[PDB]
Amino acid sequence: AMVPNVVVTGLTLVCSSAPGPLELDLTGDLESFKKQSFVLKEGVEYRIKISFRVNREIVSGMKYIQHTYRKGVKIDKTDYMVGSYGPRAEAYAFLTPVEEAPKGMLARGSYSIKSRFTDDDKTDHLSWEWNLTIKKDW
Template sequence: MSLIPEMQWLVGVLLTRSSRTLDSHSGLVTHCTFAPCRLGLRHIGLIQVNVLYFMADKEADVHEIDEADVNYQPPAQKSLQEIQELDKDDESLNKYKKALLGSGPVEIDPSAPNVQVTRLTLVCNAAPGPITMDLTGDLEALKKENFVLKEGVEYRVKIHFKVNKEIVSGLKYVHHTYRKGIRVDKDVYMVGSYGPRPEEHEFLTPVEEAPKGMLVRGCYHIKSYFTDDDKTDHLSWEWNLNIKKEWNE
């Protein structure tokens, strides 16, 4: 479950409280709002920082993740302990910190990464069985597997992940879809900001409809990325999706 807007605001406040001067070239100031927008046939949730900030779509195949061509630099990351020590006398802020961070420390293997993506599920009520992939094992093996969707069905993508140590801001899920070696689509989903906790977090995309018709049936190769505002590559993997006329065709 993603954070409610007040918690998103808290993260912005906590991460920028000690550094109020932002890059003058970016045209950004400190107050955060949220607004939906539409890119092609996909919904993308964009975080807009006080003023409408138009992101230029930049086609880049270096790491195959589209980024805004701007000079904006994210605020310096604060440790979990630093955030817990901030403004202890502010009752409302403490309330949100407790909701975001929990009431106690999270015990975790020190060698574990801060963000662990554990699995991806295609949620489809019409499917004869679960459509899920384990992302903790051999990712190379996923390239040889084929996941099936019946044409025209409605589905959603669910990402399961854990945050182990520090708050992470601006998480996003990106996937590029290829057919016969040519990229035919891209999707960018703003996942949000999350704090550490023992349980997994889940992110669910809006409802989408699988392609339909003889011309669009067949195998699609998908390259997926789970990244954040700092362009950290938390996980990259590839998989195949078959669009078929019938589930068991």
């Protein structure tokens, strides 16, 4: 079937005070990102926005799962209800709740995030890895 039912097209950290965009294009080469970092200044709020298409049928029980790492070890597994989506033309977008970038030098450092977007079939609609560095400043 030429193109798959669920195509994850992008990840964006939506953050009002970041000086520049913070987008990953997930339709391209995913191997580019382990060389790139997103920087968040400590303490700022952000959301994560995942953009995806549903091309030809109901997806139920979508979930966005996040395993976060510091220094090679797993410090957090979080997952979010995405829900149910029917096929259409325009990409959909899913926004996590508002979170706060950690503050304090128990917080600052480099984090690596393994993301999956799945549903109830445990379909790998996509998995990708990216980096997040938390800093005293931009």
